[PDB]
Coordinates of C-alpha atoms in Angstrom, one line a residue:
Chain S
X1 CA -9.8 -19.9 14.9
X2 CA -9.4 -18.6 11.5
X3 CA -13.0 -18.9 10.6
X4 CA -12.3 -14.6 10.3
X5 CA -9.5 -16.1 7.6
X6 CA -12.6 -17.5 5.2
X7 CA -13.9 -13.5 4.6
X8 CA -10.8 -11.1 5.2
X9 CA -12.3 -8.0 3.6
X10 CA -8.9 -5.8 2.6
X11 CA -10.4 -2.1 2.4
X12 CA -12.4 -3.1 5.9
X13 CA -9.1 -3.8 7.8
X14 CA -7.8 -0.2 6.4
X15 CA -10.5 1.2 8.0
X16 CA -13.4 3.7 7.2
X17 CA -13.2 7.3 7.5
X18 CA -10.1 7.9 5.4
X19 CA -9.0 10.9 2.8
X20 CA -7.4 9.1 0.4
X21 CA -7.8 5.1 -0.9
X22 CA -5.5 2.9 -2.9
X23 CA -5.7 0.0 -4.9
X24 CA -2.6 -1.3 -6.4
X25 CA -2.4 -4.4 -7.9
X26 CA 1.5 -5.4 -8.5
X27 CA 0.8 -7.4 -11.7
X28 CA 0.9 -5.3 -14.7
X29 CA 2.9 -2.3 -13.1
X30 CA 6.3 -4.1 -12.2
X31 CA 7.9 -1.4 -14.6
X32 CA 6.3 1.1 -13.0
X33 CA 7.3 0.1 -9.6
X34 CA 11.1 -0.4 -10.6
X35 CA 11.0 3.2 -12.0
X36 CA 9.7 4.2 -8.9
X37 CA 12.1 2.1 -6.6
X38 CA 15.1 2.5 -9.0
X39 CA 16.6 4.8 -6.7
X40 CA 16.5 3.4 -2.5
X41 CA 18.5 1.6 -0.3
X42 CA 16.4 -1.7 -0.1
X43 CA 15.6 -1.7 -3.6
X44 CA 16.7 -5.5 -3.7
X45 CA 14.4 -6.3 -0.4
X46 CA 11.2 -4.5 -2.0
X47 CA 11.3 -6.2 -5.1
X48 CA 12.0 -9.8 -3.0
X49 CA 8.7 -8.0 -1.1
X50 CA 7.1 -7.0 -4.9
X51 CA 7.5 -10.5 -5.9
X52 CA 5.7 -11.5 -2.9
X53 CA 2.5 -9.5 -3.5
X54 CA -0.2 -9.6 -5.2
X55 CA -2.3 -6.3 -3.8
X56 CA -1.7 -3.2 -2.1
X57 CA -4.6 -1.3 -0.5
X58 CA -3.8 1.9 0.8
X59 CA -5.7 4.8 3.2
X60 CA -4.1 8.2 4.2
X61 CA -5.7 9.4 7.4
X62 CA -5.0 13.5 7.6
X63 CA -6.1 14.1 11.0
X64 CA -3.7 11.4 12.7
X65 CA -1.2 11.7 9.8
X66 CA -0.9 7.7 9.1
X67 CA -1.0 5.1 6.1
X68 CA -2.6 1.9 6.8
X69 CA -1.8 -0.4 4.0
X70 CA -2.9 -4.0 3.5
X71 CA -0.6 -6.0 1.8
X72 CA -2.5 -9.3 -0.1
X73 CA 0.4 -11.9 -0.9
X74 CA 3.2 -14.6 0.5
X75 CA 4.7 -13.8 3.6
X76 CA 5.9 -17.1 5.0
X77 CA 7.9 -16.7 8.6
X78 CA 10.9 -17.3 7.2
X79 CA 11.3 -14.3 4.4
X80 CA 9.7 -12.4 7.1
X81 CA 12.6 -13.5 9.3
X82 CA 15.2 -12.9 6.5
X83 CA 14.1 -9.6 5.6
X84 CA 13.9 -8.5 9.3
X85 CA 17.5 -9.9 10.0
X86 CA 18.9 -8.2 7.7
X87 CA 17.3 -4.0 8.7
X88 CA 18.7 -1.7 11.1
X89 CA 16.5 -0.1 13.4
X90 CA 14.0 -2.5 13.7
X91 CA 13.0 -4.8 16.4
X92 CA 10.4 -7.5 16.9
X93 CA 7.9 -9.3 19.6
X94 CA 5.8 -12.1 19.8
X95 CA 2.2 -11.5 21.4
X96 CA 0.3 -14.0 23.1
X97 CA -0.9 -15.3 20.3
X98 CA 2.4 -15.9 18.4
X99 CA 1.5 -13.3 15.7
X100 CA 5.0 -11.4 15.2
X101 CA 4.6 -7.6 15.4
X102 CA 7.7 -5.4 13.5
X103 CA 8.3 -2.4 15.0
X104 CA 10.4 1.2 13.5
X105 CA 10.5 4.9 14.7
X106 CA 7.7 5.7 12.1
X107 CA 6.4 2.4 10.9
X108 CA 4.7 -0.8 12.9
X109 CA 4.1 -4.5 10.7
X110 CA 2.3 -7.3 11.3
X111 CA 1.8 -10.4 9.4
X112 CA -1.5 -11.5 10.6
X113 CA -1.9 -15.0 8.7
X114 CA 1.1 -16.1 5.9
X115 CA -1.6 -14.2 3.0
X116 CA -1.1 -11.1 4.7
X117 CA 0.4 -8.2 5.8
X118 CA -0.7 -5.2 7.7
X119 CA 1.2 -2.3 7.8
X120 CA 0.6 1.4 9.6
X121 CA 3.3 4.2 8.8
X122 CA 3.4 7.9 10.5
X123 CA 3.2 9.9 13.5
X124 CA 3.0 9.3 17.1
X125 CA -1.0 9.3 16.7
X126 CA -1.1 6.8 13.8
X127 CA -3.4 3.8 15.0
X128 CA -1.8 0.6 17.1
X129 CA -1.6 -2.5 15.2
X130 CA -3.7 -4.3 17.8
X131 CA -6.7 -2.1 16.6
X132 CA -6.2 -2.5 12.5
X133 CA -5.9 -5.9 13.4
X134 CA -8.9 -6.4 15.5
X135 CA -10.9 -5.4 11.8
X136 CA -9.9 -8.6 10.6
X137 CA -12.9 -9.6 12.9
X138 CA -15.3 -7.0 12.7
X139 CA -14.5 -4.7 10.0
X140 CA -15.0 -1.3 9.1
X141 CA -17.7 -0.5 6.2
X142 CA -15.5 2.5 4.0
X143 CA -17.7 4.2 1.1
X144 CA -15.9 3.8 -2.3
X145 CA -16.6 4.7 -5.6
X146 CA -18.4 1.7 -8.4
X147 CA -15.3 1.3 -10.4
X148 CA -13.1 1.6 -6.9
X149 CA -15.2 -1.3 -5.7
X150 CA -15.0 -3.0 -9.2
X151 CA -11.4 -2.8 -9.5
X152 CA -10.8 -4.2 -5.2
X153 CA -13.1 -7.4 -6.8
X154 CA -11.6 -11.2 -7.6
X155 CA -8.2 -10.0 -6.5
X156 CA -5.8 -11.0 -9.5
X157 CA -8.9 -9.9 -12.1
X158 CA -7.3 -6.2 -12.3
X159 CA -4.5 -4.7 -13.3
X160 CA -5.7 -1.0 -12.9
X161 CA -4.4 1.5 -10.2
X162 CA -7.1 2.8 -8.7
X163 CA -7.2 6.2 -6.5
X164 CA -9.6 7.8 -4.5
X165 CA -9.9 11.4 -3.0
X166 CA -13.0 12.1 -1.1
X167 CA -11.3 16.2 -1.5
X168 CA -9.7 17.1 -4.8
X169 CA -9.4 20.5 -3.2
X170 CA -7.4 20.9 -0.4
X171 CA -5.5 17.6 -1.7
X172 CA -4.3 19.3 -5.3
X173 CA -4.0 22.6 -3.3
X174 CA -2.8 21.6 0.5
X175 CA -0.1 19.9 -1.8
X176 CA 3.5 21.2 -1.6
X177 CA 2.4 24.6 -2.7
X178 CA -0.8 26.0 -0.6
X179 CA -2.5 29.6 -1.8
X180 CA -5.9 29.3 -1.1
X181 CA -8.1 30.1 -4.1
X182 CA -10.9 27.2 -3.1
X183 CA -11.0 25.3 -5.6
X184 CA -14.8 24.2 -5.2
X185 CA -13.5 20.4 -6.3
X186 CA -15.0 17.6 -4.4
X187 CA -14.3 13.8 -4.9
X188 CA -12.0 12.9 -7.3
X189 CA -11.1 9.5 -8.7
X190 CA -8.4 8.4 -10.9
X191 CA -7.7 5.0 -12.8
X192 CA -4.4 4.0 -14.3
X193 CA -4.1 1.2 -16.5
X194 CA -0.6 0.0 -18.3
X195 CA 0.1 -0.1 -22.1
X196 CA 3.2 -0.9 -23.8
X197 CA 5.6 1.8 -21.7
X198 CA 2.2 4.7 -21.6
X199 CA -0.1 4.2 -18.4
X200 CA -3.9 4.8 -20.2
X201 CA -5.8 7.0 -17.6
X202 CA -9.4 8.2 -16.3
X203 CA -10.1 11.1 -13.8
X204 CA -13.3 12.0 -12.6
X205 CA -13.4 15.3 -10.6
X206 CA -17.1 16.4 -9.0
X207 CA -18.2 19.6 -9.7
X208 CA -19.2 22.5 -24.2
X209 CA -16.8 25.0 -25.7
X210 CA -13.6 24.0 -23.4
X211 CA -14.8 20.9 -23.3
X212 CA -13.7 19.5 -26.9
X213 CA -10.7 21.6 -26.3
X214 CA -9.5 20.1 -23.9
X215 CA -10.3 16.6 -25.0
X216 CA -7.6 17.2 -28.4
X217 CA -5.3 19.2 -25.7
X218 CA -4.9 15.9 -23.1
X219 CA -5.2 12.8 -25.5
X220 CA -8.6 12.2 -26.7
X221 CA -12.2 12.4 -24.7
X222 CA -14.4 14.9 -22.8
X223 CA -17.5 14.0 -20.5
X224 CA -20.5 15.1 -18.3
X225 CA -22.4 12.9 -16.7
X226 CA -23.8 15.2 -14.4
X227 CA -21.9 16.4 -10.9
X228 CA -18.7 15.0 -12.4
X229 CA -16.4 15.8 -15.2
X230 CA -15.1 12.9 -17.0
X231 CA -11.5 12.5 -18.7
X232 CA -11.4 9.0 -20.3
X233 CA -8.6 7.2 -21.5
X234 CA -6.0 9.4 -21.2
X235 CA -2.2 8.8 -21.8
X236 CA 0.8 9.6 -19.9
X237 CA 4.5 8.5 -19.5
X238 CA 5.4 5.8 -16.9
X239 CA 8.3 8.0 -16.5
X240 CA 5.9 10.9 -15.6
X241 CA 4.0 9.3 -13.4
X242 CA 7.0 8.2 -11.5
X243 CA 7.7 11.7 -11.1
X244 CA 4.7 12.3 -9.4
X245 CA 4.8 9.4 -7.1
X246 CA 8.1 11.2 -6.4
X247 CA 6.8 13.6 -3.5
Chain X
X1 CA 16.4 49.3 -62.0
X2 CA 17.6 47.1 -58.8
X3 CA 16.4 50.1 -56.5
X4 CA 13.4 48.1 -56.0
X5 CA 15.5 45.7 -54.9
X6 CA 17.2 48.2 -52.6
X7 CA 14.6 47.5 -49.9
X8 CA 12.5 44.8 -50.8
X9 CA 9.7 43.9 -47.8
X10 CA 9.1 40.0 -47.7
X11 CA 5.5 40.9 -45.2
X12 CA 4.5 43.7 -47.5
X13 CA 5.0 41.9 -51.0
X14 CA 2.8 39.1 -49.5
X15 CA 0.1 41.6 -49.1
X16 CA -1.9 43.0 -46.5
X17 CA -5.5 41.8 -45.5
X18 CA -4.8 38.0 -45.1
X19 CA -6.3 35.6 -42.3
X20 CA -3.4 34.2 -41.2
X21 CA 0.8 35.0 -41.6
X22 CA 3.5 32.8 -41.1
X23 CA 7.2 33.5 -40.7
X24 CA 8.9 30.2 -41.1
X25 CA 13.0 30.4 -41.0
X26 CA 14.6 27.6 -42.5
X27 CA 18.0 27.1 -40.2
X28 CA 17.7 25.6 -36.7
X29 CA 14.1 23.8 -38.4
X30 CA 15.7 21.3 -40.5
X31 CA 15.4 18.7 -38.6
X32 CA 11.2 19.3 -38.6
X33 CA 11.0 20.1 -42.1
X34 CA 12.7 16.5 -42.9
X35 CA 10.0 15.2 -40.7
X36 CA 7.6 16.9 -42.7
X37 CA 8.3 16.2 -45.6
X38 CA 9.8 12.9 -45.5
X39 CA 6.8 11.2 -46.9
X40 CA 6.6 13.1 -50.3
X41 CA 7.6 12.5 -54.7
X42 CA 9.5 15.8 -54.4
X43 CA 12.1 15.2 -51.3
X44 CA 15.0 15.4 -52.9
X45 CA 14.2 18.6 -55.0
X46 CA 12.6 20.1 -52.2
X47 CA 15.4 19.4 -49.6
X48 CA 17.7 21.2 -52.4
X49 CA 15.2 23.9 -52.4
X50 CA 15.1 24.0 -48.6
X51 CA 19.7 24.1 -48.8
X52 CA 18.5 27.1 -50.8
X53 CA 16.2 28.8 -48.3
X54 CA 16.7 31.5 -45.9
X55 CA 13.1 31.9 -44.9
X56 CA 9.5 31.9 -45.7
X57 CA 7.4 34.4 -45.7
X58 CA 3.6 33.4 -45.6
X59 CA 0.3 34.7 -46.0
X60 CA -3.3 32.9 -46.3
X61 CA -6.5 34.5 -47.9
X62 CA -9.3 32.6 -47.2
X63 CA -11.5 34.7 -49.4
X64 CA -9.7 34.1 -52.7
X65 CA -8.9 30.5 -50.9
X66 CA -4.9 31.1 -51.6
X67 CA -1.3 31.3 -50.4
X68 CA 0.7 33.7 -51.3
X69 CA 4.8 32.5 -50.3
X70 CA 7.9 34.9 -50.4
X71 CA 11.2 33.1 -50.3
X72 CA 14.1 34.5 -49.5
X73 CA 17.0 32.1 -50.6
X74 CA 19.5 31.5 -53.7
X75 CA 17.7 30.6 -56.7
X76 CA 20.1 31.5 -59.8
X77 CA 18.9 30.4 -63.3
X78 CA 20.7 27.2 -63.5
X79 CA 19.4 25.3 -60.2
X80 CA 15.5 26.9 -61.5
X81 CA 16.0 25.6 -64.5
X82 CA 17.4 22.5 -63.2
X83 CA 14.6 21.9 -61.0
X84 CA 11.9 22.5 -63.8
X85 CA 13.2 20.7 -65.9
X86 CA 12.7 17.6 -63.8
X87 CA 9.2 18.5 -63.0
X88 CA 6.2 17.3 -64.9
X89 CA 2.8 19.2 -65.0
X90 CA 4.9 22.8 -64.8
X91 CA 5.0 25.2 -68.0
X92 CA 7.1 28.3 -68.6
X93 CA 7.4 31.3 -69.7
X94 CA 9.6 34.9 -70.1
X95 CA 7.8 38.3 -69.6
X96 CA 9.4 41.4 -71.7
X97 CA 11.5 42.1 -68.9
X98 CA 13.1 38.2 -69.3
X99 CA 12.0 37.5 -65.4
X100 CA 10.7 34.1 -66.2
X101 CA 7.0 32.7 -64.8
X102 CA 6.5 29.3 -63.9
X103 CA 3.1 28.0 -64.3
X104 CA 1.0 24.8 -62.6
X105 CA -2.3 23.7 -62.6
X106 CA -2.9 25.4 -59.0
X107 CA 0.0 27.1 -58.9
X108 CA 2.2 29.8 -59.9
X109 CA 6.1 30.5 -59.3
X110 CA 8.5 33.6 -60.0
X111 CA 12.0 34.5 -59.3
X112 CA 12.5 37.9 -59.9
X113 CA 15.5 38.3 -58.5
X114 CA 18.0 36.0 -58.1
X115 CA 18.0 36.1 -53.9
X116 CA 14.2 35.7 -53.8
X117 CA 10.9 33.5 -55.4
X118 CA 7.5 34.1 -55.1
X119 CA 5.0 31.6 -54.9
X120 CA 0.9 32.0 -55.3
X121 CA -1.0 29.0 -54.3
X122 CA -4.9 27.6 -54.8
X123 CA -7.9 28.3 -56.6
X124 CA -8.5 29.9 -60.2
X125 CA -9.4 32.9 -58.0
X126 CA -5.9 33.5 -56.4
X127 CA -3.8 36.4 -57.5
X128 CA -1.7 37.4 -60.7
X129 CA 1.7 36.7 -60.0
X130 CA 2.1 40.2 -61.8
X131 CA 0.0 41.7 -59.1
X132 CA 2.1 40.5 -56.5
X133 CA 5.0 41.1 -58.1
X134 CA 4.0 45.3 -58.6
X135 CA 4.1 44.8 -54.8
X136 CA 8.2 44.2 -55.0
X137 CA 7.9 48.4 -56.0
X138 CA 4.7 49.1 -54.0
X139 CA 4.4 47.2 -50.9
X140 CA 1.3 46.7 -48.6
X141 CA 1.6 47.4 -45.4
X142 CA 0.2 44.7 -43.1
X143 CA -0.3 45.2 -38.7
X144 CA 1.9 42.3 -37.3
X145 CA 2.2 41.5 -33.5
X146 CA 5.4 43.0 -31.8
X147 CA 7.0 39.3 -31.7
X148 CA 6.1 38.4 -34.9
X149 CA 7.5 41.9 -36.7
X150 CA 10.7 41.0 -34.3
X151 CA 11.5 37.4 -35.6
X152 CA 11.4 38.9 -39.1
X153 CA 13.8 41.2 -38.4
X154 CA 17.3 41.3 -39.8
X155 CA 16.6 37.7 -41.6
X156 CA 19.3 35.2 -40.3
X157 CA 18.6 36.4 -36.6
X158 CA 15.9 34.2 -35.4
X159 CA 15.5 30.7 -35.8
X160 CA 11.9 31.0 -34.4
X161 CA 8.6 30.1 -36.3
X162 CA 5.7 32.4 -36.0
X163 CA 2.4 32.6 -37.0
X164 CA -0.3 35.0 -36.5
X165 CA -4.2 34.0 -37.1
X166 CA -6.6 37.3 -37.1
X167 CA -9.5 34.6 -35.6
X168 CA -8.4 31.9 -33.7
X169 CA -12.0 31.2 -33.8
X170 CA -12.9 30.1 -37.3
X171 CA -9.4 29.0 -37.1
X172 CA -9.9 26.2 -34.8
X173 CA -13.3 25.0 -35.2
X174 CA -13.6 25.4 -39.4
X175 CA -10.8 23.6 -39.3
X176 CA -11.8 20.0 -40.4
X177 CA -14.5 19.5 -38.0
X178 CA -16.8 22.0 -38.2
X179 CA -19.4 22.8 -35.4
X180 CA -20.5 26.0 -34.1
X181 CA -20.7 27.2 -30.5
X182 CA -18.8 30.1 -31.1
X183 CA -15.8 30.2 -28.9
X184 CA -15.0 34.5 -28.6
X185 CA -11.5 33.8 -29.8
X186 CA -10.1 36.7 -31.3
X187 CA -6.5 37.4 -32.6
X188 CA -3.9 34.4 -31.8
X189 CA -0.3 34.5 -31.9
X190 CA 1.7 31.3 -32.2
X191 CA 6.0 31.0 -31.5
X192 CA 8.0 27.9 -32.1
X193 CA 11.6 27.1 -31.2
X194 CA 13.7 24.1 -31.4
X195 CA 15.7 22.6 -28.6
X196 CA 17.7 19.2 -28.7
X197 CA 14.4 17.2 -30.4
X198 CA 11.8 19.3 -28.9
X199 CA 9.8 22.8 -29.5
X200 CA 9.4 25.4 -27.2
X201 CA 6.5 26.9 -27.8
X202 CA 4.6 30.1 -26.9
X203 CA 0.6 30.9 -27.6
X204 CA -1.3 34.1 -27.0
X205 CA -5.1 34.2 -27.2
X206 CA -6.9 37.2 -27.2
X207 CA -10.3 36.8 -25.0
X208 CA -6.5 32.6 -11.8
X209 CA -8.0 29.0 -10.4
X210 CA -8.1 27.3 -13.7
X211 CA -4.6 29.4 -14.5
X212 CA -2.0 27.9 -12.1
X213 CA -3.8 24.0 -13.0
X214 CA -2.9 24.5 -16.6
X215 CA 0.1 25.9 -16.4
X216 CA 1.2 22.3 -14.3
X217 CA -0.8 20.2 -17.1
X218 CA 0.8 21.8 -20.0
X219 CA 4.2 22.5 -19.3
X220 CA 5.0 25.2 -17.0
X221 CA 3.1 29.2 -16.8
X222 CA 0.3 31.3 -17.3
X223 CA -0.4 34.9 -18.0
X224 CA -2.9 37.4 -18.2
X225 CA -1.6 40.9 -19.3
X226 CA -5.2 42.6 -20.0
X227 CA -6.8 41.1 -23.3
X228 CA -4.9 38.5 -23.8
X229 CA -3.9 34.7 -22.2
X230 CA -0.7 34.0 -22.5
X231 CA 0.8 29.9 -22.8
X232 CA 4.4 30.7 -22.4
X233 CA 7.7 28.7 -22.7
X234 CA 5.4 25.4 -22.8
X235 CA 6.9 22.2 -25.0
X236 CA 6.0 19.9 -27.6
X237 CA 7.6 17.3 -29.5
X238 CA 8.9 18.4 -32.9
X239 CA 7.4 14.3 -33.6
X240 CA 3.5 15.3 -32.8
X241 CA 4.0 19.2 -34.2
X242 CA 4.3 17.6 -37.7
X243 CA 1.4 15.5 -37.4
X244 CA -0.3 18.9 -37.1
X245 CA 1.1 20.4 -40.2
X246 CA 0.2 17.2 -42.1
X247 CA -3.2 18.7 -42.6

């Protein structure tokens, strides 16, 4: 066919529904990414992967405990083939329709078209490939956040990391360390953009005196535009930041 | 006599009453005083001064808009005359008892003693160096925080700054920028120590969801023993700290 090849909509094929969403654009953040991938096994694989993508979007399903991620870039057979020859404990089959589905214990790929990947990580109950993929036809309709959306648009335009939690609450809380105060914290968004070796940053978290405290305290600026507190352009390490990626 | 100088009390000879105190040890803080004070005319006399300089002993009247500084050091006649005698702008003279009294437009210095100086800073309504001085037989008796009364003890101990600030309130806000909601910030403490090229710092203000978030986004605890919060064993670089003193 690949008339469903003219409108491939990314965050569609991720699917709806999710607890977390990622944009990462590669471009812009290759320091980042080596600080972050400094320290694996396939280090020299991922960057050969790195240098073959353009856009990662992300979604972190809680209930089934999966990641769907979308990978926008180059993926030609053969560096498919060459990076699958070379891994241990994968294996590999060819459906029907000669699309090549990658199979681990935890993880299932698929390169869809040579533009694309589609990758699903987790438990036993994270989604079958043949479903994710089937949203390259009719796909799903998630809810994202105006600069979420802005930053997904004219893939290549951006350079900002874009997150969103539809749950700051049990997602800063249910993290690593869980006592149960409640944080009454709805969605929260976060934007990271790179500078020099500092990543400038924005966090919006739905909920004056602390409030131009706290804006001399972290960096410089304070906001309320209503539900949501605003910190704009923020500053952090990208040694930090690699920290948290960390977990 | 010298049985004044039997027990001479830096704190009390600084007088009681003032808005803020500082204890400033010289040793273990050279590093940050360089910082300081490496964009000044005097940097050479003053880094002799500092080779001569235990500790500092501070005290800020915001009523008579002065400073009133107690050095203890090693100040014998030939290095004070040596450094006055560069100096423009600074006049002299000996009292009856031959202690001599140095004299600027804003300021006013004595060395009594050879092992201390006493310095009286600001406006034409500051203090009588004579005044202060009748102090070096009469002290006052200013209320210090335990920590702060500890770091001054037994001078060549602690290599800890400390400050204490009766109001954190007008401390903070009629500082520079000057609106008024009226944070209810009563007595605050302030402890610095060095570490490789960093300060350790500790900060109590007198007034847990919010607790455990800010003791992740700066540095690591939080405290609450009755009237006071307590910021302890968080960090700073000794690069940004002098920025602050700059003012």
């Amino acid at each position: 066919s690949g008339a469903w090849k003219a409108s491939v909509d990314p965050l569609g094929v991720v699917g709806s529904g999710a607890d977390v969403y990622l944009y990462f654009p590669v471009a812009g953040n290759e320091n980042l990414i080596s600080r972050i991938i400094e320290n694996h096994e396939s280090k020299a694989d991922i960057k050969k992967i790195v240098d073959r993508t353009t856009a990662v979007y992300g979604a972190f399903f809680a209930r089934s405990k999966e990641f769907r991620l979308f990978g926008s870039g180059s993926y030609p057979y053969a560096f498919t083939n060459l990076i699958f020859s070379r891994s241990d404990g994968w294996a590999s089959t060819k459906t029907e329709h000669g699309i090549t589905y990658y199979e681990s214990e935890h993880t299932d790929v698929s390169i869809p078209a040579p533009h694309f990947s589609c990758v699903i990580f987790g438990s036993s109950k994270r989604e079958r490939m043949s479903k994710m993929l089937s949203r390259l036809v009719n796909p799903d309709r998630p809810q994202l956040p105006p600069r979420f959306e802005k930053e997904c648009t004219s893939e290549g335009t951006s350079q900002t990391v874009a997150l969103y939690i539809k749950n700051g609450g049990h997602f800063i809380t249910k993290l690593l360390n869980f006592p149960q105060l409640n944080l009454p914290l709805g969605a929260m968004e976060l934007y990271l953009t790179a500078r020099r070796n500092e990543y400038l940053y924005t966090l919006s978290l739905q909920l004056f005196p602390i409030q131009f405290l706290i804006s001399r305290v972290l960096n410089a600026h304070i906001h309320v535009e209503g539900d949501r507190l605003i910190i704009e352009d923020g500053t952090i390490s990208a040694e930090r930041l690699a920290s948290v990626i960390s977990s």
